[PDB]
Design a protein around this ligand. Structure first.
Ligand SMILES: Nc1ncnc2c1ncn2[C@@H]1O[C@H](COP(=O)(O)OP(=O)(O)O)[C@@H](O)[C@H]1O
Ligand SMILES: Nc1ncnc2c1ncn2[C@@H]1O[C@H](COP(=O)(O)OP(=O)(O)O)[C@@H](O)[C@H]1O
Ligand SMILES: Nc1ncnc2c1ncn2[C@@H]1O[C@H](COP(=O)(O)OP(=O)(O)O)[C@@H](O)[C@H]1O
Ligand SMILES: Nc1ncnc2c1ncn2[C@@H]1O[C@H](COP(=O)(O)OP(=O)(O)O)[C@@H](O)[C@H]1O
Lengths: 142, 441, 459, 439, 438
């Protein structure tokens, strides 16, 4: 909050859609925890691309999302709404033909000859046993 | 579009005698080389013999790539023909050896057959049950022919497909029961009127006849490389396409080689060995050649065809020269085809094919002048002037390319030799190898 | 929110802002000076045929070389070609130096730009219903299902836009979208007819006053019709299809979502993917639903490409789908950047040079330099006395064209800070003394750095 | 403070008459170099006027001739209002990205986008949250100067719940986004608990009105907008680096939209400066890229400095002046900085002594000026700090000549050091590794 | 304790006036170079000046590294001394100019005086107060105490599996807490349980102690660049996820300087600029010196001390340029240069005696003579390496002290490189079966 104006290093945070709380969270949570947070969010800037089309709409964008240019303008959103799925199919070529080749159903031709569980610390203490369960069987990730 | 070799539609040989015709299927001349390539092409088709390295050699132009492109057209789509530029091998994601291993294994097909089973019928009714707050879904499809009705239970994956396809009663659908894909074929009912946003009033179809289930034999061809990628991984099979695949471990390949042999013995698969064409093969390192030479020796090696423009030339990654720029103990394993520069009537015939492929109506004197240019500037330059003179002729609305258009094109665009003289005539004003230059008048 | 600036708009001037085209007659003959060019009548006429080559869809994989010394307008000619094509045709400029990525092999970097230069134009119809939700109302069914007690046969939704409102009768299955999406009266939504589902843009800003605090931003009522049925034309490159297939964007799993939180590292896109993309593209072209529109890959300082780049370009140019490539070079006879034993003209391998249409660019006469000074001055807005023009042109003959174009702005500063609305010889004679050319500076080096010393230049 | 005294701390501006651009013999810390300062002032005028894109100016001269000092003075005189990227050429040889990406980024850093915004932010200490279910609720906030009750919507009560807002917390609500932030707790609650968690901090209560409508000006680099669009939370890469060779088609979109903002008047484009120090450490592939980079509407003015004579260009084996390609030097104008006269040295050494708060005696400053003439500006400058410390060791009031003499005795100049290296060559590792360790 | 090479160097041995004593603090000679290093110590301790460079220049074995480690001990433990070699910067993770930046900031310290309130006791009560606050009761052998816990420190106590009867450690101000174990008053709650039973804490349940914490500006960089420690558990996957170095932006380092100065203005933190010492600076290349040239102009930069033993030598990365010290003349102008000279025979004798008594070796006078002779005729480093072997040989002869016999044996078991080169010249005369490989 002391660096949020002018030439100060967080000047841009008004126009990136994150709040100060979201910035502080994303700087402290790891990539997995941040990815779980992403699962909750709605790609509302992609829906705006469908609605705020016209010259009267001025390609409207909420000013606090001004710098999310590539989210507000992206063919991916439009190709999913057009009824002739032409560009929609052109964007799924790889996943379709992989499946059409039957590679998803063909028997496995190889597998690892040996398999093992992770190596573990062995320590004669109860805190070690708790910390093993907290990390190697991590409940929130699980 | 029209590309450099788009007129090449085969090798132009009598299939019975392997005799090259002097002009057919778009190839001209090179009769000795075309017969040699036809013998290679036959032993490709026969499949019996593995690991033959054939080097096509010659000066620049003279059709070495054109011959290799004629071979590819004559094999058709079924036999693998992996084109590789030797500069593709210097990956940052994998070693040159791994990049070569993948290029070989891309050139061996596994042709796998399965009996799919398909359904096709009118949807009479759909029921879907959905758990509030997500999770489980359940449903039933009632589907009809002129001759059957049956009610099929549906799982989540099929209900996802049904709703993505927006299946409705009165649709004619087919279901590939083995892959699970659905296609709407049309509708037997009208589109209703009670609702809005129903979308497209798709094609009318009469109801399918016969039984709902039909078996369907289908055949798929996959490379040994494509089997490698999905068997070195649990997840991320897009590496078939994105190229994210790392250096695959040899244990996986050794297993796959064993199992693909067993699939052949079981009659599950046919192995269809094809061609790896390494163009510009002189661009490989000594380390690459000392890999190919022993990679060739395996039973699953493809037939490797190469082209080189090089004379007695330095081998990359070492201090010394060799013929073709290729190591002698590599060339020991190679049978060499030599292409020869064309005569004026061969030039004339090629330029006529280029003109016809580009649909350009040359006047006879323009073809004569283009032939004279072809003898002295080269076939590629004389080819470039055809499409250029067509455009210039269109500026003057000429119905045919006249001599004036070829002369106008010859004026505007320099050949290589004339450009070399232009460089020599302006050595003061071009940047030298010393980096010195004079900018003043 | 943002405080719009009402002040007048103007354009920055760069080294080529004066160039506006090739300046050719309808006969294709170059006008002696036009569209910002002076001279180069041969090279402009050649580029005009190249322009008509590109606009004719027969071309695939042709090569052009712009050959000539530094300062001779090869960059200007490439930009003029680009302007003659206009924005509807891709022009993809790079230097040879940009191909040396750290992140993929350089043949991938070049094939990306090769496919960036190829455009695809896809026409489709967008078909939606769109508005603020004015009502939601269940239509109880005539024949309810036993054991449920509730059975709805239609859900009715009112949508309003700025331009109207409609009573919309929807298949009751939309309950699933509404309940997941949490649509409410006063929310702005669209219904897409290819699914019958709905998506929520936000709450209508007509309701922005409902509370002293609510935790969402509001969005304006859609200013279009309540029902849109529009053809939409999408600019696509084939490189966009490469990336969109090779790294799918919307995946809702943890590995996809972790992937999109980490840097989008380039990958060595396979030829198998590119060749299948081509086949599906050619299918849709034959259906007539898409146009292929090949454009221009322009590589400046192409002598910075090495022999591995050139040997790959042989294969690349032979592709049945390919842009035109225009090369510019100034390197005399020079060592090939990756083949130290080999020298060739233009620094281009003789193998590859035979493929290119070479276009030479020549030096400029003293009177052409003067005409360029006139064009450049009025473009930067500077105005000169004729004696200032002649002095600038004289340095252009003796030193370099570029150096004299670069004196205009400094002298314009010195004139205005001396109270003069036009620049005169006194200002040119002053700009030329503050701002040395390379030769006069090199003379200072040669005199001062004749030895080591406390005040010597370092070498 | 945390800024210590540095080599260019005395440089406070460019030192010219703002009307005529005529320099004066010293001001703002600079001494002499009048033509170079006048030329630098002429460049600074076209930087500030901004319409001239992509000029390149080379500052060329021997070591210790004020090339960096003039670049600092130009940056000071340009002020904070305009971007001034300062790049050592060594920084471009990144392992995480290609050299042309690293040059592209530095170019993008030097163009500012300026936006002015007003937005409603409500900040205060929470007094109570009240909730009813039958969803609605009420929020009481105080400043030092107000207390008010606000109706909260359902989504707002959820956000309060998700973020564990208690009484005594300081919260901010951006009404434009609707998002809550918790700044901390009021320091009045310092006695509310015996033990506090790691993530808790106390604050002074917000002051004045609860909801404020400040007008704020924002200037962001084009590089920042790139890195923000690079990936879903790309703004984090602005700090860790942690960014790829950004796709050109992203920059293509951003340039097109920034032009729309300038057409619509939402933003003002503020072209600034890139200063590339030791530009002779670039290679032939950097220079050939920079040619194209300069030739664009969004190119900054690029200043660069070199001290090289005729010297080999890097990435090749031929020599050229300044160590730069002539193909590149054709696009450049050159400013030449000269050596200094003894009277200019005498002034600079006085300015340094003042900035270092060292009281030289007149004889010490005279002797120190002789050393500056005989042994170079930087060596005599470094003796100022040394003589101050030696004087302090004898508790002297002023730096005398004896303190400069002992400084000169203890620390060799480069020339006297090179003589020592020549005199003892067998005791030192030669270029062929030979050495004798014996007496 | 162990005896490394420099362990006899206790300091610079300067007079009150800053003149060097001819033998003091375990130095002999180098008086002019010790006095010059004394002024560098004053420069550092004044903490007025950024980014002054110093060069130590002189032959190998002339004490350049003794002098740098004497400075490090004149500065004491408070001031950060960051030693590297010029070869350490060729990291594979990040550009070498980033590695220099990280080492400049390791040389700048930041000191915080933190009062730690520790409560360690058996958990006698855990009473959730709200439905947020917890009350916890803790007991030692010497009384019990109640504490009001913020919901944050409560959930930390609750994320650890603390229960009544457990023994715990709490830091009141930091919010750190640890389960020390289960109190052994419950040791017979079962006859076997997978549990660790510990005695009740026998001191005060409350302790207050003041710890002068030191960090560095690089520590603040690393903490702010990425989630660290328990914030990033997925780091356990390695590959993409491990805590790689990244090329920190100067936006971050500038914004860190802002925050750090805020806490200096509050008086919470004390800034302590120190020293970056680079040995074998001739292993730096032209691009590194090009960066150092700029980086020394920043207002924070530490004092940099360089050592080189090269004569006129090619600079790395530009074989076209030969310079003294292997340092580019461009950059050499920026440095205060201290020459170190070779030692006299009498000085070698004194250094031998100093190190003998530091290894605990004791010598006859003739044993000192013979070792010192090898110091003069071969190398100071060689003769000092004789001392420990000769002590072993004397010990296994039962002798209390090393004598000529034990050195004359050591010098024949352990050759110098000079006699070894003579053996190579006599024996590697040809590529025969018993020849050395060429
Ligand atoms: N015998 C031929 N018949 C038809 N076209 C040919 C023949 N030889 C060469 N060409 C054409 O001339 C051009 C150059 O030949 P190409 O095969 O590419 O030479 P290279 O062997 O050097 O690759 C191509 O466009 C090719 O189609
Ligand atoms: N024929 C011309 N007419 C007008 N301006 C020109 C012409 N040729 C070059 N210029 C201008 O002079 C400068 C030098 O040309 P440029 O294309 O940069 O040379 P190069 O081909 O060596 O890059 C550019 O600013 C360009 O706009
Ligand atoms: N004209 C000047 N006035 C005042 N100080 C100067 C002047 N020129 C150089 N200096 C100072 O002398 C030192 C060396 O100058 P600098 O410009 O950094 O060297 P270089 O010439 O290598 O760029 C710096 O501390 C600088 O501040
Ligand atoms: N002046 C001195 N007085 C006492 N011992 C010294 C002195 N100089 C060096 N030594 C000892 O001899 C060893 C060799 O010196 P060293 O500093 O390693 O030389 P350099 O680092 O210059 O190669 C050191 O480890 C130190 O223990």
């Amino acid at each position: 909050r002391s660096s949020l104006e002018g030439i100060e290093n967080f000047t841009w945070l008004r126009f990136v859609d994150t709040s100060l709380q979201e910035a502080y969270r994303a700087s402290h949570t790891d990539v997995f925890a941040r990815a779980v947070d992403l699962a909750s969010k709605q790609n509302r800037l992609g829906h705006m691309q469908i609605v705020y089309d016209e010259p009267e709409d001025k390609k409207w964008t909420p000013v606090h999302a001004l710098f999310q240019i590539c989210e507000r303008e992206n063919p991916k959103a439009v190709a999913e709404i057009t009824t002739e799925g032409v560009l929609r199919d052109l964007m799924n070529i790889a996943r379709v033909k992989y499946r059409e080749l039957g590679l998803c159903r063909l028997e496995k031709a190889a597998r690892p000859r040996a398999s093992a569980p992770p190596i573990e610390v062995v320590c004669d203490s109860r805190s070690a046993v708790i910390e093993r369960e907290n990390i190697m069987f991590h409940p929130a990730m699980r | 579009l029209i590309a450099a070799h788009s007129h090449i539609r085969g090798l132009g040989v009598d299939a019975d005698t392997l005799e090259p015709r002097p002009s057919s299927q778009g190839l001209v001349g090179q009769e000795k080389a075309r017969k040699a390539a036809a013998v290679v092409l036959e032993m490709i088709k026969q499949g019996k013999i593995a690991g033959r390295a054939v080097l096509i050699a010659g000066p620049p132009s003279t059709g070495k790539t054109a011959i290799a492109m004629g071979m590819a057209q004559s094999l058709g789509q079924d036999v693998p023909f992996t084109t590789l530029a030797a500069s593709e091998i210097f990956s940052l994601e994998m070693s040159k050896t791994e990049a070569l291993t993948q290029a070989f294994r891309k050139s061996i097909g596994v042709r796998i057959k399965e009996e799919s089973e398909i359904m096709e019928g009118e949807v009479v009714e759909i029921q879907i049950d959905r758990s509030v707050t997500g999770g489980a879904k359940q449903g039933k499809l009632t589907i009809k022919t002129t001759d059957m009705e049956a009610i099929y239970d549906m799982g989540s994956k099929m209900i996802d497909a049904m709703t993505k396809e927006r299946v409705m009663a009165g649709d004619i659908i087919s279901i590939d029961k083995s892959s699970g894909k659905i296609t709407k074929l049309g509708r037997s009912y009208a589109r209703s009127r009670d609702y809005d946003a129903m979308g497209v009033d798709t094609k009318f179809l009469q109801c399918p006849e016969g039984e709902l289930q039909k078996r369907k034999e289908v055949v798929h061809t996959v490379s040994l490389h494509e089997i490698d990628v999905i068997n070195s991984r649990t997840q991320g099979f897009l590496a078939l396409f994105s190229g994210d695949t790392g250096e695959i471990r040899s244990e996986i390949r050794d297993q796959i080689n064993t199992k693909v042999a067993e699939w052949k013995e079981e009659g599950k698969a046919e192995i269809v060995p094809g061609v790896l064409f390494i163009d510009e093969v002189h661009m490989l390192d000594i380390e690459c050649f000392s890999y190919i030479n022993r990679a060739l020796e395996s039973d699953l090696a493809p037939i490797v065809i190469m082209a080189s423009n090089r004379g007695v030339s330095r081998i990359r990654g070492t201090d010394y020269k060799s013929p073709h720029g290729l190591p002698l103990d590599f060339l020991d394993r190679v049978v060499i085809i030599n292409t020869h520069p064309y005569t004026p009537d061969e030039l004339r015939q090629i330029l006529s094919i280029r003109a016809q492929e580009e649909e350009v109506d040359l006047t006879p004197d323009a073809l004569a002048l283009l032939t004279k240019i072809g003898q002295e500037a080269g076939l590629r330059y004389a080819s470039n002037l055809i499409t250029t003179s067509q455009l210039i002729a269109a500026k003057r609305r000429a119905k045919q390319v006249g001599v004036e258009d070829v002369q106008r094109s010859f004026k505007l665009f320099y050949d290589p030799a004339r450009s070399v003289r232009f460089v020599q005539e302006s050595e003061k004003r071009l940047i030298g190898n010393d980096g010195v230059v004079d900018f003043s008048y | 929110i943002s405080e719009v600036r009402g002040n007048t708009r103007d354009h920055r001037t760069a080294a080529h802002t004066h160039i506006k085209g090739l300046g050719l007659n309808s006969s294709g003959i170059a006008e002696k000076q036009a569209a910002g060019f002076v001279g180069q009548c041969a090279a402009r006429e050649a580029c005009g045929v190249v322009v008509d080559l590109i606009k004719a869809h027969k071309m695939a994989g042709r090569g052009v070389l712009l050959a000539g010394g530094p300062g001779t307008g090869k960059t200007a000619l490439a930009l003029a070609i680009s302007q003659e094509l206009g924005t509807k045709i891709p022009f993809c400029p790079i230097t040879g130096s940009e191909i040396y990525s750290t992140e993929v092999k350089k043949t991938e970097v070049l094939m990306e730009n090769f496919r960036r230069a190829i455009g695809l134009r896809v026409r489709e119809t967008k078909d939606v219903y769109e508005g603020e939700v004015t009502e939601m109302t269940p239509e109880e069914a005539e024949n309810p299902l036993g054991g449920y007690g509730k059975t709805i046969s239609t859900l009715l939704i009112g949508l309003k836009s700025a331009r109207g409102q409609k009573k919309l009768r929807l298949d009751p299955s939309i309950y699933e979208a509404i309940q997941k999406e949490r649509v409410q009266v006063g929310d702005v939504i669209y219904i897409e007819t290819n699914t019958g589902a709905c998506k929520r843009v936000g709450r209508s800003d007509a309701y922005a006053t409902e509370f002293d605090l609510e935790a969402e931003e509001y969005v304006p009522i859609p200013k279009g019709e309540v029902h849109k049925k529009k053809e939409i034309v999408q600019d696509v490159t084939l490189h966009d299809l490469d990336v969109a297939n090779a790294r799918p964007q919307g995946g809702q799993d943890i590995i996809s979502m972790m992937g999109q939180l980490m840097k989008p590292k380039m990958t060595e896109i396979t030829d198998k993917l590119r060749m299948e993309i081509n086949k599906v593209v050619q299918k849709y072209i034959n259906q007539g639903v898409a146009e292929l529109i090949p454009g221009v890959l322009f590589i400046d300082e192409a002598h910075m490409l090495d022999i591995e780049c050139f040997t790959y370009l042989n294969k690349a140019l032979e592709s049945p789908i390919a842009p035109i490539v225009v090369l510019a070079s100034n390197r005399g006879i020079a060592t090939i950047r990756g083949a130290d034993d080999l020298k060739a003209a233009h620094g281009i391998p003789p193998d590859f040079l035979q493929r290119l249409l070479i276009i030479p660019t020549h030096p400029y006469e003293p009177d052409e330099i003067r005409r360029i000074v006139r064009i450049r001055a009025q473009t930067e807005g500077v105005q000169l006395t004729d004696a200032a023009v002649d002095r600038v042109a004289e340095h252009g003959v003796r030193i370099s064209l570029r150096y004299c174009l670069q004196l205009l702005a400094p002298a314009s500063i010195l004139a205005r800070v001396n109270g003069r609305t036009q620049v005169d010889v006194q200002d040119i004679a002053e700009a030329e003394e503050l701002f040395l050319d390379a030769r006069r500076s090199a003379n200072i080096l040669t005199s001062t750095g004749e030895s080591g010393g406390l005040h010597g230049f370092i070498s």
